Amino acid sequence: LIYGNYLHLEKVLNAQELQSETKGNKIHDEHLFIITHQAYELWFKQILWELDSVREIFQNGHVRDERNMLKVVSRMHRVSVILKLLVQQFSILETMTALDFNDFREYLSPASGFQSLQFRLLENKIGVLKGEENELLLKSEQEKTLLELVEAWLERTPGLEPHGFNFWGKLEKNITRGLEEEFIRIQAKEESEEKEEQVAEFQKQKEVLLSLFDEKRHEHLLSKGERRLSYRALQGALMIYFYREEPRFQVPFQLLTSLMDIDSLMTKWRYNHVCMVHRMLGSRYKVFVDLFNLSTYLIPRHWIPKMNPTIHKFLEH
Amino acid sequence: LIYGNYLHLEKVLNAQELQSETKGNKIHDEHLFIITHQAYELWFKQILWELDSVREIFQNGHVRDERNMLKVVSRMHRVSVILKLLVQQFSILETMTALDFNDFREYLSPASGFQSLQFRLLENKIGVLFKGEENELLLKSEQEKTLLELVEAWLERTPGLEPHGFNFWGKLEKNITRGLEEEFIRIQAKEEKEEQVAEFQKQKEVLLSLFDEKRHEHLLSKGERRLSYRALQGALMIYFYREEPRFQVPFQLLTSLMDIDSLMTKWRYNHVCMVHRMLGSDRYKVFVDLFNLSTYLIPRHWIPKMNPTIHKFL
Amino acid sequence: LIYGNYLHLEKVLNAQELQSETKGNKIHDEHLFIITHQAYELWFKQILWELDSVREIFQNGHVRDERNMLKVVSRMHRVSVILKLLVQQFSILETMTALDFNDFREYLSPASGFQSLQFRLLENKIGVLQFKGEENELLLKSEQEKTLLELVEAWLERTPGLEPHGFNFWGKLEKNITRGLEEEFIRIQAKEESEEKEEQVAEFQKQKEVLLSLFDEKRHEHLLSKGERRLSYRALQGALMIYFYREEPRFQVPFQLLTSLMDIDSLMTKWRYNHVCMVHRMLGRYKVFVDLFNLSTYLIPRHWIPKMNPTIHKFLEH
Amino acid sequence: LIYGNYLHLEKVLNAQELQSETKGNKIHDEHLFIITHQAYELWFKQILWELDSVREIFQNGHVRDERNMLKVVSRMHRVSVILKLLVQQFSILETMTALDFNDFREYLSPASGFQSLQFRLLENKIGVLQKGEENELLLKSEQEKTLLELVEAWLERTPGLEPHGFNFWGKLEKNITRGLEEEFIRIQAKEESEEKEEQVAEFQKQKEVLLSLFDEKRHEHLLSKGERRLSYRALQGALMIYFYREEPRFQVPFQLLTSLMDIDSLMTKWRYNHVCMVHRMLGSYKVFVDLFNLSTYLIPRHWIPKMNPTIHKF
Ligand SMILES: Clc1cccc(N[C@@H](Cc2ccccc2)c2ccc(Cl)nc2)c1
Ligand SMILES: Clc1cccc(N[C@@H](Cc2ccccc2)c2ccc(Cl)nc2)c1
Ligand SMILES: Clc1cccc(N[C@@H](Cc2ccccc2)c2ccc(Cl)nc2)c1
Ligand SMILES: Clc1cccc(N[C@@H](Cc2ccccc2)c2ccc(Cl)nc2)c1
Ligand SMILES: C[C@](N)(Cc1c[nH]c2ccccc12)C(=O)O
Ligand SMILES: C[C@](N)(Cc1c[nH]c2ccccc12)C(=O)O
Ligand SMILES: C[C@](N)(Cc1c[nH]c2ccccc12)C(=O)O
Ligand SMILES: C[C@](N)(Cc1c[nH]c2ccccc12)C(=O)O
User: Fold this and answer.
1) Chains with 3 or more CB pairs closer than 8 angstroms to B?
2) Which ligand has an atom closest to residue A277 CA?
3) Minimal Cα distance from B40: which residue of A?
4) Which residue, among B44, B58, B74, B64, has the nearest Cα to B271 in the 3D structure?
5) Under a CB-based contact definition with an 8 Å cutoff, are residues B254 and B290 in contact?
6) Pathway involvement (chain D)?
7) Directed axis angle between helix B69-93 and helix C249-282, to 10°?
8) Inter-CA distances, C41 with C116, C121, C275, D13, Å
9) CA-to-CA distance for C1 and C3, rounded, in angstroms?
10) What is the largest CA-CA distance in chain C?
11) Would you give the DSSP letter of residue B304?
């Protein structure tokens, strides 16, 4: 097949219409403003294509066969590699001065906000808090998000069962026993400024570590919007974090890592967008907050419940 | 106007047809192969748009008005910023395995070579030495004045080259020959230290070769050199007196022409690596003379000093 | 000279001491934490080296000889190229998990804040408003000596074309803006009494209030005192002169300088942003050149800019 | 512990001595030349730290416990992330002109070649074919087991290769020969045409390449000439991981083989950039070839032997 025909370059390379030229005098830098945003749209289509395919593996039940974990992780990694290029793409509009932008702003009247349908679809399908387009926007909100599909899959994490292993029970016992042992060590210290400072550190860290086990606090924060994943999904994600080296949890740990990567890359893009808007015109959204929050619970290695010989065979291929 | 209408997203976002899907079974990774090359094409259109505008400033005589030097240099810098992003873009196809590419390769049968019309137009318009009106557009790119030719013409008019008004080439030949003569007496010291006499003979052969107009006319004919002898003198004048206000922005232009040249090479290098990655870069740089002139190791003290009248002029 | 001796690799490659290894059990990922921060320090030394050299060109009066504008602009561009690499460098600590960082954190107890002496010196020398010893002498010198913002402010106050006797840029600008706004008010009043006219009447009143605020020296002196602005009123006039007449040969390279000062400023912000994200990842716009950003976004139509007289055009030509 | 003391900044920040300043007149741009190469050295020490730790997991037998595959893959991925930054680092020396480099070149006299001990150690420890205390470190890098050798040993133990068990090589040879026989008959059907001739040539070229995989004598010959580095048994093992990458036990080893090719091509991009830098200022063999070669054997999906239910569970 011919390169140009295969890539439909008759549509792609004939979609650049300068409003300054159509409404009188052409402004050279306006072509850059068209091309950058068209190139963002081509990459948003690729990100959407990969996102929906990963969503489909979860929805249609193929995620149950752990043979499909490679395809899930490699497509999410591809999404982060694309996002890194889109953040780098801002360097191109930075080659345009605001003084030059002012010469063609008037012909477009650009609003200082996210006006991309694909970016809104992307935000909705991940799990962010007219006419034919409105149907696509409604479907993005009604259908299962990546956050929901991941939450469902996390609730089935092996090792959580109270009969077998009882990860949450052993964790609560080891943390409370470790904090009790730490309190005694602090009390036995010589009464000094450092000893009083260590009581504050201990009391603060104890309040934080034990708050993990407060299901009522989590249910309250979930209602306020400050948390997104279920209490059972939090236990499942922590199981993957703590036992990441276990073969059945190695690739799911890479998945949880890339979901946090995509989340912070989405934030860097929005940050850059806001900077660009202020550069030209002048003067919470983390879907996987729980994954970032769970990754910063500072539990000492020795307090993590150990893997039994029978349990070690359970999380092995 | 509305974002999607302004960007004509009805054409842009409805140009993705997977040949695996049209000819039977869809292969997911084929969409990435379409999008990357369409995104390269959007940027090749922008690079062409900037390149032709800079070519126009030289062709229509606006380069004579030094007020336009900022616009020329900023658009060439923009071309290098876009090229750096296109070199970075190879990281996206690197997320596709060759094993996965093999699953959709039969539906397109990709040739191991540059098949872009815009890339060939870009190469031609800079100065690098398939059917219908595309062959006519390719012939216009070969017939019209290249950036190398337009820059060569402008370089021949560089101030300070006047045979008696400064006479840059005459003073340079005299100071270099006198400096090499003074170095030959200082080189001839004790026993052969032997490495210093050999290094002098090699460096003398290279430095003095600059003044051989017959050797340059020969290399120009063989294709090993692209700029005229007068243009070489003009570019060296800008290099040596880069600090002079009139030569500050033209020095930025000569540097960015070498930057775009080496970025064009990095892109072609990456393309060849990608082709070998999926299936079973030399000194052909348009501005070879600019790289060659920038590496002539003439000591700072040997450069002719700026005349009091010439210092006000430049 | 030998590569390793020239680069003093006997010091550089023997400066990596893992506190986990020193205090008992070694933790592999701790070496990464040392190397990345030592590499940031090497580049902070280079940025300081370039910054001080550019500061010296302004202090010793060499900036007056416009022959030195290339050296000033190329070193500031080099500073932004280095800053872009430092922002990219965050990708290396992102290869370390917070869970793995936790295994060596106890041995160092890293504070969640900027603890680099060189980064503080860099911030001070540029002109950032806002525990040591001996190093407190270097910190005091950074605070007492002229900042880049001050040196640039002084140089901006000397911009050609500002003089009321010759050209009078500020006078012509105020006249053309007020006359242009008066002509725009007539076009708004000459329009019907429709919703579009009233919507345009409010947009005109707001845009007129913004444009004319540029000429309020008392408002600027107040904002300067509150910290919301950093450059003098005369320096603002000088920077706008360079912005509007950037094409003029004598103003081409100074325009590149003003552009790179805004680039370094936003790159310094991206670095601090990334630092804060890294700290939250592991543990859980006060820009120096605000005025340059603010002046670049005053939406004045091209036709309202005062024209260059034939005698004045020859003045700004080298 | 204090930031500056912990990082030993007393050594790090007092290792910059400009030879221009020591030998008379200081040249400002010389400081950049020192800092960039010192920063490359800090990263070569980190790469070596990660590389040796991964070598140790293979040497001490910990690679046998597949629980350690995550730590092996994440440290190799970290090595490629560091290498990408070192390739990006060339942008810093590109802010220095050759004319400015010439003003300090005389004081150091830099040779146009790899003069780093750490880069040589890195090259040797990966497996690149080839002072007093430093010469001992260089000899240990050549005598000790390379990453290529340690990976080759581990690849020879890949499950599924055993002729008694799954017999991957036997089923592959049978399916390829039968598939090529079926393709030959399909080609020899339409009347002798240009398209038929194009199909006969493509078939004969692809048949010669596919069947060459089963020539152990050709591989033993190429291994002796240096054109190939991995043993014949290791090639079978790597192809087993490529073809059955989706199998849970082979998912992480596939990521490892992918990153070994990434590090390899990044090492090439670094050396390429080094050579370009040397030509910019003066003017003047991939360790895992077999992994790249195996990834480009164009075998149709349906010809790959199907996973036996006994082998799939293992
Ligand atoms: Cl192509 C186009 C058409 C109409 C508005 C925009 N606005 C930009 C923001 C922006 C505004 C002024 C100066 C620089 C940038 C924009 C970019 C991306 C998105 Cl998702 N929405 C919006 C762009
Ligand atoms: Cl979109 C399309 C359609 C048909 C052929 C190509 N060939 C690629 C090269 C390439 C070949 C195989 C695997 C990876 C890459 C190509 C890329 C860029 C250019 Cl200018 N020409 C050519 C691509
Ligand atoms: Cl090498 C070293 C020694 C002691 C403290 C820090 N703190 C880091 C911040 C940071 C803290 C925890 C996890 C990740 C990062 C830091 C980095 C840069 C600067 Cl200027 N100050 C501080 C680092
Ligand atoms: Cl720090 C130092 C001291 C002495 C020689 C080199 N040579 C550089 C190459 C190079 C040569 C001239 C101009 C630009 C670059 C070099 C860089 C990296 C390595 Cl591994 N070996 C060597 C550098
Ligand atoms: C059979 C299973 N894939 C089990 C499962 C669920 N979540 C997981 C997380 C990590 C590892 C395994 C799981 C499934 O139920 O989908
Ligand atoms: C007025 C002029 N631009 C002079 C000129 C020619 N080449 C140059 C290079 C550097 C500086 C100036 C020139 C012209 O004749 O076009
Ligand atoms: C002679 C002069 N260099 C003039 C000057 C000052 N600031 C400027 C900005 C742009 C152009 C020129 C200047 C001086 O007074 O420093
Ligand atoms: C037990 C084992 N790790 C088996 C092994 C060897 N090479 C492999 C490649 C992929 C998967 C497994 C292997 C060993 O013998 O090292």
Assistant:
1) A, C, D
2) 1
3) A39
4) B44
5) yes
6) Amino-acid degradation; L-tryptophan degradation via kynurenine pathway; L-kynurenine from L-tryptophan: step 1/2
7) 30
8) 8, 12, 14, 8
9) 7
10) 84
11) P
**Which atom of ligand 5 is least distant from the CA of A248?**
11
Structure determined by = X-ray
Q: Let me know: does C104 contact C23? Beta carbons within 8 Å.
A: no
User: Hey, is A9 helix, strand or coil?
Assistant: helix
With tokens 């050579």, the residue in question is D275
Structure tokens at D44: 């070569």
For chain B, breaks with the C atom over 2.5 A from the next N come after: 129, 192, 280
Q: How many domains does chain B have?
A: 1
Q: Among residues B95, B102, B79, which one has the least CA distance to residue B27?
A: B102
CA A130 → CA A126, B4, C28, distances in Å? 22, 12, 55
Mutate to test the pocket of ligand 4, among D37, D112, D282 (most ligand atoms within 8 A of CB): D37
**D7/C78 touch (CB, cutoff 8 Å), yes or no:** no
Beta strands per DSSP E along chain B: none
Give C309's DSSP letter: P
> What token pair was written down for A297?
């619970």
Q: Is B23 helix (H, G, I), strand (E, B) or coil?
A: coil
| Amino acid, res. B47 | I
Is residue D75, in this structure, part of any structural domain at all?
A: yes
**What are A253's two structure tokens?**
């740990």
Residue C184 falls within a domain, yes or no? no
Token reading at B185 = 């007496």
d(CA A276, CA A40): 14
The tokens describing C271, both together, are 């670095």
Contact A239, A159 (CB under 8 A): yes
Q: Does residue B94 sit within a domain?
A: yes
For residue C33, give the H/E element and its range.
helix C30-59
Asked if B262 contacts D276 with a C-beta cutoff of 8 angstroms, the reply is: yes
Residues B98, B84: contact at Cβ < 8 Å? no
Examine residue B193 and state whether it is found in any structural domain, yes or no: no
C-alpha distances in Å from residue C120, one per residue of C136, C138, C139, C230: 11, 10, 8, 19
User: Quick one: which of B145, B175, B172, B124 has its CA closest to B293?
Assistant: B172
Whole-number Å distance, alpha carbon D21 to ligand 4 midpoint, is: 19
Classify burial at B168, counting beta carbons within 10 Å of its beta carbon; exposed 0-12, middle 13-18, buried 19 or more: buried
Residue B219 buriedness (CB in 10 A; 0-12 / 13-18 / 19+): middle
Residues in chain A within 8 Å Cβ distance of D246: 67-68, 70-71
Owning domain of residue D20: 3-161+225-313
Atom of ligand 4 nearest to the CA of C7: 1
Rounded to whole angstroms, how far apart are CA atoms C259 and C256? 5
CB B105 within 8 A of CB B112: no
Instruction: Tell me the C-alpha distance between B87 and B67, whole Å.
Output: 32
Resolution (A): 2.6
Domain holding C88: CATH number? 1.20.58.480
CA angle A72, A73, A74 (to 5 degrees): 95
Give Cβ neighbours of residue C22 (< 8 Å, ≥ 6 apart): none
The conformational region for residue B307 under phi > 0 = left, psi -120 to 50 = alpha, else beta, is: beta
* DSSP label at residue C66: G
Mention every residue, 6+ apart, whose C-beta is less than 8 A from residue B270.
B87, B90
Pick the closest to residue C244 from C184, C149, C311, C312 (CA basis). Answer: C312
Give the end-to-end CA distance of chain C in Å, rounded to a whole number: 44
Q: How far apart are CA D57 and CA D67, in angstroms?
A: 11
- The pairs formed by A275-280 with CB atoms below 8 angstroms and a separation of 24 or more are A275/A90, A275/C266, A276/A90, A276/A93, A276/A94, A277/A112, A277/A113, A278/C293, A278/C297, A279/A94, A279/A98, A279/C293, A279/C297, A280/A98, A280/A101, A280/A105, A280/C297
C-alpha–C-alpha distance, residues D6 and A126, integer Å:
41
